[PDB]
Amino acid sequence: VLSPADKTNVKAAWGKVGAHAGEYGAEALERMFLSFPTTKTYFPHFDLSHGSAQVKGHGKKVADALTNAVAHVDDMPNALSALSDLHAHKLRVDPVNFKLLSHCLLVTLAAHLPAEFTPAVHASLDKFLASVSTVLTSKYR
Amino acid sequence: VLSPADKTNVKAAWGKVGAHAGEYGAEALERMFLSFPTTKTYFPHFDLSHGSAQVKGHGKKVADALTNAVAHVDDMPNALSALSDLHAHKLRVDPVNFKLLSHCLLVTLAAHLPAEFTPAVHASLDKFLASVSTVLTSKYR
Amino acid sequence: VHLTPEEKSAVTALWGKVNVDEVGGEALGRLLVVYPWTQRFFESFGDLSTPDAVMGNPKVKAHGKKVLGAFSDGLAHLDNLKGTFATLSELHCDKLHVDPENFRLLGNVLVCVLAHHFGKEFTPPVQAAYQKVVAGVANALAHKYH
Amino acid sequence: VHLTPEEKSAVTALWGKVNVDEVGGEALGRLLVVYPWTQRFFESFGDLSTPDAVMGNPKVKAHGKKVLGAFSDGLAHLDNLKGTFATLSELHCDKLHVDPENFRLLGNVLVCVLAHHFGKEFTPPVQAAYQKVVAGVANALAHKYH
Ligand code: HEM
Numbered sequence A, B: 001v002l003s004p005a006d007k008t009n010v011k012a013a014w015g016k017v018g019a020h021a022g023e024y025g026a027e028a029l030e031r032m033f034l035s036f037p038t039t040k041t042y043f044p045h046f047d048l049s050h051g052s053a054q055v056k057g058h059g060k061k062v063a064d065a066l067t068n069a070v071a072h073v074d075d076m077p078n079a080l081s082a083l084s085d086l087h088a089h090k091l092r093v094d095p096v097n098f099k100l101l102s103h104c105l106l107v108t109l110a111a112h113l114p115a116e117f118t119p120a121v122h123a124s125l126d127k128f129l130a131s132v133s134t135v136l137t138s139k140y141r
Numbered sequence C, D: 001v002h003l004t005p006e007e008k009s010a011v012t013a014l015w016g017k018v019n020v021d022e023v024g025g026e027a028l029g030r031l032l033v034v035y036p037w038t039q040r041f042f043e044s045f046g047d048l049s050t051p052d053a054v055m056g057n058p059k060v061k062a063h064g065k066k067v068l069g070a071f072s073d074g075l076a077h078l079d080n081l082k083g084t085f086a087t088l089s090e091l092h093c094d095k096l097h098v099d100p101e102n103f104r105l106l107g108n109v110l111v112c113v114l115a116h117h118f119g120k121e122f123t124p125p126v127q128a129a130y131q132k133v134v135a136g137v138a139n140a141l142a143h144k145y146h
């Protein structure tokens, strides 16, 4: 469970992300595809070349969804309801992959938030991504 | 996320385990130690040889906890509260291990319940063990 | 994979009693029931709506036979699983786009099915040898992924 | 592991800019803070109550230095990690009783520290290179477990 402090930390870091959310989303995917090639099995319909419009567009959607979650941290299940259905009934991405994208998102924020990525913030972000993943995978079975 | 059918399947299967719960718990631990040797790192103080009274004793405690969990399937967090505390703040077993013991418990159930271990019951028990594992690791951080 | 004489012996003896067609149909069926998201690879198989539909689906049974059949061939080459499964590895990545985590799930369901089928004969030590084998096979099939 | 000439060079180049003792104390401290259960081995280190206590703990730092010094030395033997870490693998298993999962956790924290430390220089390809290395070392350390 996200503590009051985690929620504060997450809001602080994401607020700093601000307008770059979309660019950070695209970079986190690129990191993922490179570091963990097996995640590419879910995107055979995409041009995965660096800076492709498809990756950029998808990076943007992923970032928007995370902003939504930050915005509704106290009611994530409700907020991400549609996305949880989508992943559970259509996309059907194995749950292990959520951990790999979370790690890559963590790396992207670390690389972009030198002042804000303290040990405490790092812990809170990791919990936050874990919680988002839990929500997205909740309806799988 | 246990449906009414899942609850029914779990109580049915666990009902057939009955008095044998402790023997099965011991057997699941033994399966675990042999199959996934890294789990032995948590029991440096035990004699892990086949037939070990220590494994047997531990198996009985594990099994009783599972019985308590079935009895309170709709109120698991409260019923397993001291165990969640224990694992989170004292034992500090890496979360990954819970899936290894869950698998070994399924194999054990399978080996002893030929008629009961239908595909549908297998699915419900895996859901159940995942839920118990989630509760046991809920207070880790 | 490096198996001790005893583990190798264990694996072989049990495999001699296995009806690959039947065990195969069962393992695949249970994978689709227990981990429903795996169904994403079988849209053309027909009805997979309920456990009974899955288990009784003829395309599931057919495919299960095919998979376990290839698995069996790997048992004959425990000494070189990567080389044995190279071609299929490449197929599963390049043409089928199957996440290798599914290999791991199938391995575990298979263990569950052997235990279910063999009961008491599927002892802790036998299980341990099979766990090494399924992990090896999953590894081998994942090897040529890029 | 098997790294392309290009990845080996990317790995080496960045490592030359690393203050081993500083980065070591930092990765170890973050591991204890982010995954608190790893604190189980360090009860003799004193105060680990808060993030600030952990990060400022002299013994955490000292341990961090030792661990990362070993890691560093390891980078000179990327072609023989298993051989290089054999003895440490056995020690970690037989006497320290460290679940190898902890190696994987430290490796992911190390990657985050490098990213934090280097910013944009820690590009996606450089990350990929380091990921293979941290997995390789975790694998080498877990190799002798039994
Ligand atoms: C925090 C984790 C994640 C979030 C927030 C997220 C969010 C989203 C969103 C918002 C969409 C688009 C929905 C729409 O257009 O209506 C999407 C689609 C998709 N996601 Fe997820 N996702 C996550 C994790 C993953 C993972 C780990 C994978 C696989 C490795 C994945 C694979 C996909 C795929 C294949 C699509 C469809 C893309 C397309 O066809 O355009 N997702 N995701």
Ligand code: HEM
Binding pocket: B039, B042, B043, B058, B061, B062, B065, B066, B083, B086, B087, B091, B093, B097, B098, B099, B101, B132, B133, B136
């Ligand atoms: C369904 C999952 C599990 C359940 C229900 C469970 C339950 C229990 C119970 C009831 C106890 C005894 C507590 C007491 O003394 O009051 C215990 C202790 C312990 N458990 Fe867990 N446990 C689970 C998973 C695990 C896992 C996966 C591991 C590690 C591989 C683990 C390691 C331990 C250890 C080391 C102890 C202390 C044993 C002793 O020294 O006597 N447990 N557990």
